[PDB]
């Protein structure tokens, strides 16, 4: 029912920027809060940022506040994560998801992000 296509990852140097995008389909996008999660190998998955269904409220992990910005476009069914001032600690595969269904265990492919020291 749900399909999430992430892109925009890559390799940058400490201090660079990346814009992640997620194109969503198969559910009523405007009805759900969306989140960006990151999964590094061997580490706990972390919810990086989240945005309510309307965009009116946002959540950020403390370590990315002021550097990451989450947004959404309900006309285009898209979620964005603008990552500025990247740091090595940000290296991970990034996945986007409707909050309500994170527990269901179905994920897109994610998009790899590597920040060279």
């Amino acid at each position: 029912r749900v399909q999430l296509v992430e892109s925009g990852g890559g390799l940058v140097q400490a201090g660079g920027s990346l814009r992640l995008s997620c194109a969503a389909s198969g559910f009523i996008f405007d009805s759900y809060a969306m989140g960006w999660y990151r999964q590094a190998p061997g580490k706990e998955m972390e919810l990086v940022a989240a945005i309510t269904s309307s965009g009116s409220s946002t959540y950020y992990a403390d370590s990315v506040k002021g550097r990451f910005t989450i947004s959404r476009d309900n006309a285009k069914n898209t979620v964005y994560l603008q990552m500025n001032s990247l740091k090595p600690e940000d290296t991970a595969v990034y996945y986007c998801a409707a909050l309500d269904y994170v527990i269901d265990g179905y994920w897109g492919q994610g998009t790899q992000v590597t920040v060279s020291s």
Partner: peptide
């Protein structure tokens, strides 16, 4: 190392409540 919402994994603090979190971030 804190407890997190078991649905979306957002971290909880001493001021979090299930009801407020569910209302803000999940659908009834």
């Amino acid at each position: 190392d804190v407890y997190k919402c078991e649905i979306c994994k957002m971290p909880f603090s001493v001021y979090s409540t299930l009801e407020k979190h569910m209302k803000k971030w999940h659908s009834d």
